[PDB]
Structure 1
Amino acid sequence: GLLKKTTGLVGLAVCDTPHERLTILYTKTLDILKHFPKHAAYRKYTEQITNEKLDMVKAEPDVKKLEALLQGGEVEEVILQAEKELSLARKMLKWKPWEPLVEEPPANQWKWPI
């Protein structure tokens, strides 16, 4: 299909090679996820999300039909989101949110009405 003239969003430029770029970002995300503990839920769910999207990119070579499958807007918004998930995974590796609750609140902290 013919390359897009604009994405429709100010500041978001057209990607010439969206299939390649998505493959790079999703593959990079799955690499950093192997550094998480196996039991961490963020790893398991993000692996499911990413593999599902990676298989769509492998399946569909048409950009327009790929956008229909991904359901994340223009393919350039999908690429942007893919970069955001990768950036998050690097942060989650240092935050370690999978660890037990750091502290309980006071007993009536969340009791409403008082």
Structure 2
Amino acid sequence: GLLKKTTGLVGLAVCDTPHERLTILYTKTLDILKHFPKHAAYRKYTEQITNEKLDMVKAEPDVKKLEALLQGGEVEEVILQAEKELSLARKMLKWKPWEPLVEEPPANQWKWPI
């Protein structure tokens, strides 16, 4: 029944309707994660995280138990993480990090001391 009329942080709305924004964003990340090459580690590890956080969103409908169970702060903080992570997947698709190393370093570049 409660709606946390004020969120803890400033600049964040109250987001009166959770469990729908989270399901939409986590589902979107999986679809974009499906366009990655299969061997790329980002596809493997990010699926294992989004799916884990997708089950928990469907598991408990109460928000107060979701924030505690889903250890990511308040629901709003968790949602802004899905958006940012969703942005990362798009940027990952273009940078193509999974390719092998380019231009291994010169002879001594991490030799400390001198």
The interval holding the TM-score normalised by the smaller chain is over 0.9
CA distance in 1, matches of 2:108, 2:59: 53
Instruction: Identify unmatched segments of 5+ residues in structure 2.
Output: none
- Alpha-carbon distance, 1:69 to partner: 1.0
- Alpha-carbon distance, 1:13 to partner: 0.8
CA distance in 1, matches of 2:3, 2:83: 22
Partner residue in 2 for 1:91: 91
**SS of structure 1 residue aligned to 2:87:** helix
- Alpha-carbon distance, 1:26 to partner: 0.1
- Alpha-carbon distance, 1:91 to partner: 0.2
Alignment of 1:54-73 (within 5 A): 54-73=54-73
- Alpha-carbon distance, 1:16 to partner: 1.2
Deviations 1:39-96 (A, max 9, x none): 0000100000000000000001000000011100000000000001000000000000
TM-score (norm 1): 0.98
Alignment of 1:8-27 (within 5 A): 8-27=8-27
- Alpha-carbon distance, 1:22 to partner: 0.1
Alignment of 1:1-114 (within 5 A): 1-114=1-114
State percent identity of aligned pairs.
100
**SS of structure 2 residue aligned to 1:19:** coil
- Alpha-carbon distance, 1:7 to partner: 1.3
CA distance in 1, matches of 2:98, 2:69: 31
CA distance in 2, matches of 1:57, 1:17: 13
**SS of structure 2 residue aligned to 1:43:** helix
CA distance in 1, matches of 2:7, 2:95: 34
TM-score (norm 2): 0.98
Instruction: Identify unmatched segments of 5+ residues in structure 1.
Output: none
> Which consecutive segments of 4 or more residues in structure 1 shift more than 6 A?
none
RMSD over equivalenced CA pairs, Å: 0.6
**SS of structure 1 residue aligned to 2:3:** coil
- Alpha-carbon distance, 1:8 to partner: 0.8
